[PDB]
Amino acid sequence: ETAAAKFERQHMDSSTSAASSSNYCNQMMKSRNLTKDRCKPVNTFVHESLADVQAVCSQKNVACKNGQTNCYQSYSTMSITDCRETGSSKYPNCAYKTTQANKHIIVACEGNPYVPVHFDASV
Numbered sequence: 001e002t003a004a005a006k007f008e009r010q011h012m013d014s015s016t017s018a019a020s021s022s023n024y025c026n027q028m029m030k031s032r033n034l035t036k037d038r039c040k041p042v043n044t045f046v047h048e049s050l051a052d053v054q055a056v057c058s059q060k061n062v063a064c065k066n067g068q069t070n071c072y073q074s075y076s077t078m079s080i081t082d083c084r085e086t087g088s089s090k091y092p093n094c095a096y097k098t099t100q101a102n103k104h105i106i107v108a109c110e111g112n113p114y115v116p117v118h119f120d121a122s123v
């Protein structure tokens with residue numbers, strides 16, 4: 001699995017313009033293998049074309065949280081959904097608070113082609 005393909009699986013959801021229910025996260029985290037070896041604590045999904053998110057690799061260059069300079073912030077807010085684990089969730093019954101938002105995404109890019117491999121933050 002390429003880092004790029006991995007990024008699409010953990011972070012991308014073109015299927016829908018946003019989460020409708022408070023249990024998007026439960027379905028999505030399970031169905032993308034994010035709750036397989038353990039319950040991943042937090043995970044953001046992005047509801048935009050794969051082309052709109054890839055285009056972020058030549059938008060606003062900013063400093064990554066780990067110190068590298070291959071991070072880029074989007075000029076536009078984008079539709080995102082934050083999944084956060086509930087303290088009353090125990091593997092294997094992973095449970096998640098769904099949160100819908102419009103924020104700028106920050107991603108790290110790499111490769112030829114230069115594509116997103118890492119989600120750094122949203123602002």
Ligand SMILES: Nc1ncnc2c1ncn2[C@@H]1O[C@H](COP(=O)(O)OP(=O)(O)OP(=O)(O)O)[C@@H](O)[C@H]1O
Pocket residue numbers: 003007010011042043044064065066068069070071108109110117118119120
């Ligand atoms: N500037 C960077 N910061 C962090 N990771 C980076 C950076 N640039 C490239 N990467 C690469 O991205 C890959 C994926 O990182 P990671 O597993 O944290 O992705 P993620 O989508 O952030 O996962 P999570 O949702 O668990 O935070 C790593 O193999 C790493 O080499």
